[PDB]
């Protein structure tokens, strides 16, 4: 897609292996927020949003949390609380044309900044401060979307970069995406480490009478510490006790 009307995909219910990405390194730039690209390979996620578009190679700077500028302001904002990763690479080899590749478009201006993660497909003339022109171009009355017109005789910063931004969430839902790590038997008594769908901790695991309702992936103490989990393979509610611990 154009970064105007950028595409979105609900990547889910599958096994990822981001090592194939992080280690491929063919793309020029790769950045992450809220995770390292290495540790990323060993987590599970409730959902993943993959969005992709094309922008000028300098504009990649704006595709980050809290940036400002026409791309972030009018094409793809990112929330300050964002988590995910941005990747981009020079794609001049595929996206330029001898005469400008006017297929791609970007909204040059808008009545206000976009929502931090919203999409805007409208194409009304951006009204002037003058009386409305009702679809007539004129004084400040402009068609809202400009074309980059990518062509090869163009500076690297201005060369087209196609971009994929992955974003994901960590809700109360079960994970639907996880890394390639294997899984063990459950040593259901000894003090052990555990990693249930990425929930990382240590304790004595045990059976429980907690009688979770079917939607309940976790249970918590009055302290709001985690206290039980359903074993995602057994679907059985196991209680978690902290290991033997005290002053000597």
């Amino acid at each position, epitope marked *: 897609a154009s970064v105007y009307a950028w595409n979105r995909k609900r990547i889910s219910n599958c096994v990822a292996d981001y090592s194939v990405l992080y280690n491929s390194a063919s793309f020029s730039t790769f950045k992450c927020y809220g995770v390292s690209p290495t540790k990323l390979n060993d987590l599970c996620f409730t959902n993943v949003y993959a969005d992709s578009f094309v922008i000028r190679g300098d504009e990649v700077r704006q595709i980050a949390p809290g940036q400002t500028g026409k791309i972030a302001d009018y094409n793809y904002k990112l929330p300050d609380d964002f988590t995910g990763c941005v990747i981009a690479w020079n794609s001049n080899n595929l996206d330029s044309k001898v*005469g*400008g590749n006017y297929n791609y478009l970007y909204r040059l201006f808008r009545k206000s900044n976009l929502k931090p993660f919203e999409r805007d497909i409208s194409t009304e003339i951006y009204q002037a401060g003058s009386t409305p022109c009702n679809g007539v171009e004129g004084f400040n009355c402009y068609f809202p979307l400009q074309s980059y017109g990518f062509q090869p005789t163009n500076g690297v910063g201005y060369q087209p970069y196609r971009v994929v931004v992955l974003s994901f969430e960590l809700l109360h839902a079960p994970a639907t995406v996880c890394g390639p790590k294997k899984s063990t038997n459950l040593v259901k008594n000894k003090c052990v480490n555990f990693n249930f769908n990425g929930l990382t901790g240590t304790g004595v695991l045990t059976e429980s009478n907690k009688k979770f309702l079917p939607f309940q992936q976790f249970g918590r103490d009055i302290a709001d510490t985690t206290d039980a989990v359903r074993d995602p393979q057994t679907l059985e509610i196991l209680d978690i006790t902290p290991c033997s611990f005290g002053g000597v």
Partner: antibody
Amino acid sequence: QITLKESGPTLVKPTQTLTLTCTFSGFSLSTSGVGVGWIRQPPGKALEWLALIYWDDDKRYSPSLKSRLTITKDTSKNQVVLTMTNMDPVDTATYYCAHHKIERIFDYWGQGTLVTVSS
Amino acid sequence: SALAQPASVSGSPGQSITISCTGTSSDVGAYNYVSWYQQHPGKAPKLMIYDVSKRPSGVSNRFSGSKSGNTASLTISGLQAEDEADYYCSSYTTSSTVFGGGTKLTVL
């Protein structure tokens, strides 16, 4: 293998419009980022790019001759049909159709066809 | 043409040879994708350098190249009589794709 092949009448009177069909194989012109263009070479002078068509039905022509050049294709026949009106005798030259990518500005070239403008 | 070349250059076997190419700043910019084509008389040019020093599959390993600013340069290591052919630099311009004036190599 990937190849291109020029075809059409090599002799055209100047009043008529030359039509040339380049036939290709080993790829589909619908492939993203692929294009096919034309190059001609009169005897002993440098080469001149004429026209280029991209997979996405997008057309380009040399502005010095864009008025006269008209290019067309039929992906179902794996053919690019070029046409240019009002042949000047000076247009008599060898003509080439070639496979194009941005990275490989003209990777593979057809055999080329002679073109002559006279009686 | 917006791209110019020496009409001819001379070398001898086992020596290096260079054919320069000159762009036109007003429509070459980064002067990227500057290719070089060999053309023996009566044959279709064959791409041999696409990006500077970058060689397409079926590379004749002796062929090589370089660039310096607005000046491109083809380099052939260990000349041989088979090199004697036309050489054309070519690069994109925002108005159009263009070819250099060619160079008539002589391989003494």
